[PDB]
Structure 1
Amino acid sequence: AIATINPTTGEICQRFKALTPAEIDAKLAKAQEAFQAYRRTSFSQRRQWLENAAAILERDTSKFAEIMTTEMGKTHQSAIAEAEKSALVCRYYAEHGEQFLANEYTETQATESYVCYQPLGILLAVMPWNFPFWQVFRFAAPALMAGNVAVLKHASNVPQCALAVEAILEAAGFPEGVFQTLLIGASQVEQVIKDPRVKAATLTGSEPAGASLASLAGQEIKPTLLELGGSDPFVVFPSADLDEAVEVGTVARTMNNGQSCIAAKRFILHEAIAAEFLEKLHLKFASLKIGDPMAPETDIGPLATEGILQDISRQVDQAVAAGAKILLGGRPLDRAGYFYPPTILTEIPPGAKILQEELFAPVAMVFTVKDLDQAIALANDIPFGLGASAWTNDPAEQQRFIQELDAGAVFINGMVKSDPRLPFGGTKRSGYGRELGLAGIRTFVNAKTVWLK
């Protein structure tokens, strides 16, 4: 159901009525009318409204963070960072969007020949609960700067976040119908994708959700962008700064209570450093503070939902039954709220299903390898291909990791992070298309070739 259920206490706080198909239709009609006027606005107006939205996010950061924490359990401090990052991407496209969409001229026999960039129309965004502000602003800032309008189907467990994003954009000055939150369930999305006024769609979330949306959009001849999770490797080689790698690796696995597409999920350790690294990782994980995410000292809040908790509990239980060893954690906490402790699994047997799954919780799989070829093969031995992190100060190793890791992003001597300045997206079953950077504003526009005699 569409509801705020606080994952720290399990309390149902507020329920929301889903829109009916007629109500969805009315919102799409309004979006179409809004688009016809909005496509004619100047970049100066769009820039003003985007910068206003950034300023709202920058002023009321703590309030917005409290909504996120209440609904989905990420620490209030990380939710503050998320609101700040949302403001950053608004400012990024305010500052660069017009330039990024300017005519590009190519010399031909024409007096004038160029490509110009024009909005498609209504874009559908289907978004997940894990970064309930950032994922939305990541899409919405370039969408709106480009002159598109947007309808958001957010996750059913973050309705207050979804409503707050629309309220921010209204307060910023964006005209009515330019951005609309649809309080609707997963079964209601098909109507939106099939509506002739809706021109494109993006989804961030699970593979089954992405497959459903993309198959439907494909049938309707509509372009998509998908970002669908990962099982990113975190490779540590003998020339690495081991203490930095342990600290950063701990953050990479456990940030957002582990619920990140680009969490470090599989630690691949060269045998020369594996014992030292693993012992340090074990101790670092054991010192993490688990508790109320509203408290500034908390490292690990609850998982977002009972379902996520049930999923990881089963995944771990099955791996252990198959022969995997629990170095730390491995069982849900006996307390109120959907709490699962930082966990480290080792000696996972070959062929165990968990090797191919995404662990959306603070649960690290650990492996040892003997050389560069083995590290790369293991790193790539997954259906996903989102991010990858590798730690080494040998230039030849650095170049091989960069070249041969099958991922949309490769970070050397740092954790994978998204950044408005650089494109971001997956390969393989992690999806396709790129958000952020120039790519983010070029994805859902008509690149119109113009030739004038």
Structure 2
Amino acid sequence: IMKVANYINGEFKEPSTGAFQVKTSPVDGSKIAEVPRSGREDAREAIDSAFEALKAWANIPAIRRAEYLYKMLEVFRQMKEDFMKILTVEGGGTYRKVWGEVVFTERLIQNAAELARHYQGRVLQSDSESTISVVFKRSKGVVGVITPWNYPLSISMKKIAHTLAVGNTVVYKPASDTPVTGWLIAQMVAKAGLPKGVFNLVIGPGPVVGEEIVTHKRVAHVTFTGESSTGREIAAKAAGTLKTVTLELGGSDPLIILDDVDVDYAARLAVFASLFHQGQICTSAKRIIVHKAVADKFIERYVHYVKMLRIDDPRKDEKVDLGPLINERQVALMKEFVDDAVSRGGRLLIGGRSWGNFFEPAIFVDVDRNFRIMREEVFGPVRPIVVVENDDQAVEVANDTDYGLSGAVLTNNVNRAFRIAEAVESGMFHINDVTFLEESHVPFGGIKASGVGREGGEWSFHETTYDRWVTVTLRTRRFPIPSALK
């Protein structure tokens, strides 16, 4: 009953040119909706609207912004089943995946509302007599939000909800493969009645709409989640107007399994960590590293559970384990990974078939450091298992990557756990749990090629505000020039 459109300055509307594109389902190729193909002028209109809305939005008390976010939370709760539907048909997520994403998104919006009133500055001791010295927190201004296709709702809303809570306005450009999720977000914001211009949605190509956002002089900050190469390009262009950035650029997270574990549980945990959402998760367990003393048993058990994974149309029922990859380019890439591994002498334990956008888990052993699946982020269900002889070796292999997002170790030994945790070069680490653990109010982010900054709760607030030192001097002073005085 409704057309998909941009949302700019309180109004749903077509791109100025009227150009559109057809969004199809990765499940079966069927048509989902025609969507805007916006260009530079649509981006500019959104930026100007965000800019004009900024001062009124930033200057109201935090409690008023919290109120708007609680309204959004209310509307989101009403829209849950619409979001689940779209995440499944447009993004290819299974029922359990999209259910989890929606539950997390509810928690994120609530978290941002909860924290709005409580972001504190500092009162300082002055080294000088008769002076008051404090630090306020101020919003950065208009913030560009540029997001990916894998968890398009939760990733977008973590950025959007927290950025808004602290008095910034937003220009949001969703991934081209997930525009309907972006439009549903705009629907939610509009029904919650946020002031015009405070939130704007522009649907269009990254190299056009996104680049205008990154280079516009009125944008103060860009928060971006996507590929490491896209991020470095954005960071470079952002420097032109000295805007700050937050960048979460993918990972190749190590899951380290020691010899003292419950092997069967380790295998159940490893299967979930490595293959959930078809491995299309930035903090997926992309490189599995097992101690030789349990390697045979682990590999056997891991493959045993992988055999059970059910791959199907995710709309079929609630128990489907894996849906399709997002598009044909992803399938082609996964084929290259498999092909490279096999040609290098790698042992394909299980899997390898694809059809349309579907791609089965493909598990390898007997790999070395020059395999493409050891050297690159594998954003799909192709996974190497590496056998190591001791903990030093576990750490060496774990760190032999350009990335550094998350990581995990399974062991019951407190010494081995903590030593490995300290030595693994990552922004996040988890002992006895999956690599993709995530909470709404924790600092989520990486080091090395995985990007810059942290998002979640107050860490998001840190990214999109600045500290403002203000003093009051209560005494008159004498000055060193002109020395001829008095």
- Shorter-chain TM-score above 0.5: yes
Residues 84 and 220 of structure 1, relative CA distance in 2, 3 Å threshold: same
Identity %: 29
Quote the offset at 1:2 in angstroms. Answer: 4.8
Q: Which amino acid aligns with 2:272?
A: V
Matched, 1:241 2:295: no
| Matched residue, 1:166 | 186
Q: Secondary structure at the match of 1:420?
A: coil
Matched, 1:121 2:141: yes
| Matched residue, 2:391 | 372
CA deviations on 1:73-130 (whole Å, 9 max, x unpaired) are: 011231122111111011112112321x223111113542121111111111110000
From 225, 235, 241, the counterpart of 1:220: 241
| Matched residue, 1:329 | 351
Q: Which moved more, 1:85-94 or 1:13-22?
A: 13-22
Following the alignment from structure 2 to structure 1, what is the Cα–Cα distance between the partners of residues 455 and 445? 6
Contact 2:88 2:98 in 1 (8 A): yes
Following the alignment from structure 1 to structure 2, what is the Cα–Cα distance between the partners of residues 349 and 40? 57
| Matched residue, 1:287 | 308
Following the alignment from structure 1 to structure 2, what is the Cα–Cα distance between the partners of residues 176 and 340? 43
Name the larger-Rg structure.
Answer: 2
| Matched residue, 1:208 | 229
Following the alignment from structure 1 to structure 2, what is the Cα–Cα distance between the partners of residues 244 and 394? 16
Contact 2:162 2:457 in 1 (8 A): no
CA deviations on 1:285-338 (whole Å, 9 max, x unpaired) are: 1101100112201000000111111111111111111111110112313xxx40
Following the alignment from structure 2 to structure 1, what is the Cα–Cα distance between the partners of residues 73 and 276? 24
Contact 2:63 2:116 in 1 (8 A): no
Write out aligned runs for 1:349-360 (5 A): 349-360=368-379
Q: Which runs of 5+ in 2 are unaligned?
A: 1-19, 474-486
Quote the offset at 1:59 in angstroms. Answer: 3.1
Following the alignment from structure 2 to structure 1, what is the Cα–Cα distance between the partners of residues 372 and 434? 26
| Matched residue, 1:68 | 87
CA deviations on 1:106-164 (whole Å, 9 max, x unpaired) are: 11135421211111111111100001100111111110011001111111111111111
From 309, 316, 320, the counterpart of 2:338: 316
Following the alignment from structure 2 to structure 1, what is the Cα–Cα distance between the partners of residues 413 and 351? 34
Q: Which moved more, 1:225-234 or 1:315-324?
A: 315-324
Query: Runs ≥4 in structure 1, deviation > 3 angstroms?
Result: none
From 88, 104, 110, the counterpart of 1:91: 110
Q: Tell me the C-alpha RMSD between the 2 structures.
A: 1.4
Following the alignment from structure 1 to structure 2, what is the Cα–Cα distance between the partners of residues 435 and 192? 20
CA deviations on 1:245-267 (whole Å, 9 max, x unpaired) are: 21111111111121000001111
Quote the offset at 1:375 in angstroms. Answer: 0.2
Q: Which runs of 5+ in 1 are unaligned?
A: none
From 129, 149, 157, the counterpart of 2:169: 149
Quote the offset at 1:379 in angstroms. Answer: 0.3
Q: Secondary structure at the match of 1:411?
A: strand
Contact 1:254 1:342 in 2 (8 A): yes
Following the alignment from structure 1 to structure 2, what is the Cα–Cα distance between the partners of residues 23 and 60? 27
Following the alignment from structure 2 to structure 1, what is the Cα–Cα distance between the partners of residues 372 and 27? 30
CA deviations on 1:337-383 (whole Å, 9 max, x unpaired) are: 40000121111134223311111112221010011100000000000
Contact 1:258 1:360 in 2 (8 A): yes
Following the alignment from structure 2 to structure 1, what is the Cα–Cα distance between the partners of residues 463 and 168? 11
Following the alignment from structure 1 to structure 2, what is the Cα–Cα distance between the partners of residues 344 and 28? 46
TM-score, normalised via structure 2 length:
0.90
Following the alignment from structure 2 to structure 1, what is the Cα–Cα distance between the partners of residues 256 and 21? 40
Following the alignment from structure 1 to structure 2, what is the Cα–Cα distance between the partners of residues 180 and 299? 35
Matched, 1:252 2:273: yes
Tell me the matched-pair count: 449
| Matched residue, 2:483 | none
